[PDB]
Write a protein that binds this DNA or RNA. Sequence first.
RNA 1: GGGAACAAAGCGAAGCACCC
Lengths: 32, 256
Amino acid sequence: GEADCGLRPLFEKKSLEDKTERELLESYIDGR
Amino acid sequence: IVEGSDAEIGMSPWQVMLFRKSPQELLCGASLISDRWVLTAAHCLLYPPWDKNFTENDLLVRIGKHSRTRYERNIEKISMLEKIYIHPRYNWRENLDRDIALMKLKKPVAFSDYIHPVCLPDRETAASLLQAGYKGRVTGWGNLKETANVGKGQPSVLQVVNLPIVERPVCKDSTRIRITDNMFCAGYKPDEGKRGDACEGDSGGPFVMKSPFNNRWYQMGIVSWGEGCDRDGKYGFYTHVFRLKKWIQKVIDQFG
RNA sequence: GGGAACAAAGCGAAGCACCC
Ligand SMILES: *C[C@@](*)(O)[C@H](CCCNC(N)=[NH2+])NC(=O)[C@@H]1CCCN1C(=O)[C@H](N)Cc1ccccc1
Ligand SMILES: *[C@@H]1O[C@H](CO)[C@@H](O)[C@H](O)[C@H]1NC(C)=O
Ligand SMILES: [Ca+2]
Ligand SMILES: [Mg+2]
């Protein structure tokens, strides 16, 4: 394990994103 | 959670509520890491300076919740604890070093739209993502204001806030308390204008990161301690999950 | 070089006493 961890049934598994996850992804742009 | 907002439904399906049987009250947060293991902060279970020393039968876990108080019929699941494991070097006397505990459930929970485990980081994932300036996410039903009795400062539903990881020397200079290599801190600096923090009630809850490499959510931190909540020049402190992963795995590999 | 080091004592946008 843990096979299928970290993938939310109502978001990643539906290819839908929550309202603020883009803020997390943008924080990687630079660093560090 | 101070200066966060309402979670969306199913936004944090690994969120667990630790709940006292008598009186009936919320104790802490926690996270689901498999169908029968729950991760939380040691000080939620054992803190002698507050005469706190819970046994398995004092507690429930409530999984799949959104409302703080309403019983969520056909959504939430309630499990009893089979056993509690406190980190054997947990330092409650000084600084809550290694503020981490595992709870084994009496029977496995079934996963659903609202219940799903978070990943724990491997070395590469931790080394890549646990960097100052990167943001993660903290969730809880804890207090809305530094200043739990007061119902105006208790949320109706699960709260969420995103916060950047802070450079270790800044964490260290912010406080007279000794910061160990098994902790990190997060929060906006006063010059960054934005606000937010965990607070009392949020301990045990997860600090999570979404991996840009495989789109999976990883728990990097556990809400552990602070001084006040959301003060300028103060930061929240978190147990460093990757640093204590060997212990987590040891317990799980050994105890079923 | 390998293991261990329940990240133990330590050492910056933290990544570097035991056995073979
Ligand atoms: C148990 C948790 O709900 C809570 C989390 C507080 C988080 N605060 C912020 N701003 N992110 N933890 C605590 O209340 C812990 C447990 C014991 C005392 N404590 C503290 O946070 C004190 N305020 C400071 C402290 C005292 C002694 C040892 C370490 C920290
Ligand atoms: C906690 O509780 C158990 C009894 O349930 C007791 O044996 C143990 O010594 C207590 N520990 C502390 C530090 O108070
Ligand atoms: Ca602050
Ligand atoms: Mg150490």
